[PDB]
Amino acid sequence: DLPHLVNADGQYLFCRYWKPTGTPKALIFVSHGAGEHSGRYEELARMLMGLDLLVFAHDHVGHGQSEGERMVVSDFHVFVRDVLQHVDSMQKDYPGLPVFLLGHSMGGAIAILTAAERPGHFAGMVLISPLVLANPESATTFKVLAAKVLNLVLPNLSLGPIDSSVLSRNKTEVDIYNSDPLICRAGLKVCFGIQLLNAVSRVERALPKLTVPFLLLQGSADRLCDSKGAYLLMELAKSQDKTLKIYEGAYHVLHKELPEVTNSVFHEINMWVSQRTATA
Ligand SMILES: *C(=O)N1CC(c2nc(-c3ccccc3)no2)C1
């Protein structure tokens, strides 16, 4: 019934397209975060479409309208593999067009790993508070062993849900998040937590080979993706074209923050993509 794609595992992924009026100047894949879905990028995608970019996305496996057990993945690479399948299909239909990636949180880790796998292939990357760092206690050898032991007997055991108030200072946006039936707000499963640990470890190893141009947007008061991870990405990525913008006191969901932050986020992405699309 709906726009879709069939991944390498035979699973249906729900697809979303925002096609401009005329001929597109570039392609841009939108990569959503953990627990959320592509429908949350409607406004950002309409702005990008207004620059004559063909915006495309899919709900990651186990998310939104895609198939799979909710917030579960055999291996984190499945997400990267599926992004590449979607990118390769779009590029076949639009040959010679530059292709960008836009990722938020876990979607940002997916974008980094997607670009690292194909050096020199992507024109640029927009990262909104990407997942790059593991929490202090969470990644010790003891904690990794304990979680792996737990995973063997209770893989679907929930770590406990987070306070949704840490997502944004915009109370309306916290309320929208809390009432969206396509969002999984259930606590993080032990098996998925291990996969997010794999993601962060793989990101760290990928940084010395990351050369793709990028715009990095980060809130200073982010409790999910600590701002120090954004500084480390600026330092360790080998990219010749890298920009960091810090939003003072802002939380995690920058594109759904207080109007002053959200308007700046939209404007900065608009300018950054526009300058690298005129380049084509
Ligand atoms: C963005 O999509 N993500 C989800 C939020 C996050 N990361 C973690 C986590 C847990 C253990 C090890 C690494 C990362 N929990 O919530 C940022």
Swiss-Prot record:
Cellular compartments annotated: Cytoplasm, Cytosol; Membrane
Active site residues according to the UniProt entry: S105 (nucleophile), D222 (charge relay system), H252 (charge relay system)
A single Gene Ontology CC term: cytosol
PROSITE patterns associated with the record: LIPASE_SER
UniProt pathway annotation: Glycerolipid metabolism; triacylglycerol degradation
Membrane topology: Peripheral membrane protein
Reported impact of C225A: Reduced 1-monoacylglycerol lipase activity
Record has Lipid biosynthesis as a keyword: yes
Entry keyword Hydrolase: yes
EC number(s) on file: 3.1.1.23
GO process annotations (BP): acylglycerol catabolic process; arachidonate metabolic process; fatty acid biosynthetic process; inflammatory response; lipid metabolic process; monoacylglycerol catabolic process; regulation of endocannabinoid signaling pathway; regulation of inflammatory response
InterPro entries assigned: AB_hydrolase_1, AB_hydrolase_fold, Hydrolase_4, MAG_DAG_Lipase
SUPFAM superfamilies: alpha/beta-Hydrolases
Annotated phenotype, changing C191A: Does not affect ability to hydrolyze 1- or 2-monoacylglycerol
Catalytic function, reaction form: Hydrolyzes glycerol monoesters of long-chain fatty acids; a 1-acylglycerol + H2O = glycerol + a fatty acid + H(+); a 2-acylglycerol + H2O = glycerol + a fatty acid + H(+); 1-octanoylglycerol + H2O = octanoate + glycerol + H(+)
Molecular-function annotations in GO: lysophospholipase activity; monoacylglycerol lipase activity; protein homodimerization activity
Keywords: Cytoplasm, Fatty acid biosynthesis, Fatty acid metabolism, Hydrolase, Lipid biosynthesis, Lipid degradation, Lipid metabolism, Membrane, Nitration, Phosphoprotein, Serine esterase
Tissue distribution of the protein: Detected in adipose tissue, lung, liver, kidney, brain and heart.
Modified residues (3'-nitrotyrosine): Y41
Domain of life: Eukaryota
Effect of C184A: Does not affect ability to hydrolyze 1- or 2-monoacylglycerol
Note: Short-term inhibition causes analgesia, while long-term inhibition causes tolerance to endocannabinoids acting on brain cannabinoid receptor CNR1, and a reduction in brain cannabinoid receptor CNR1 activity.
Job description of the protein: Converts monoacylglycerides to free fatty acids and glycerol. Hydrolyzes the endocannabinoid 2-arachidonoylglycerol, and thereby contributes to the regulation of endocannabinoid signaling, nociperception and perception of pain. Regulates the levels of fatty acids that serve as signaling molecules and promote cancer cell migration, invasion and tumor growth.
Quaternary structure note: Homodimer.
The protein's name in its UniProt record: Monoglyceride lipase
Species of provenance: Homo sapiens
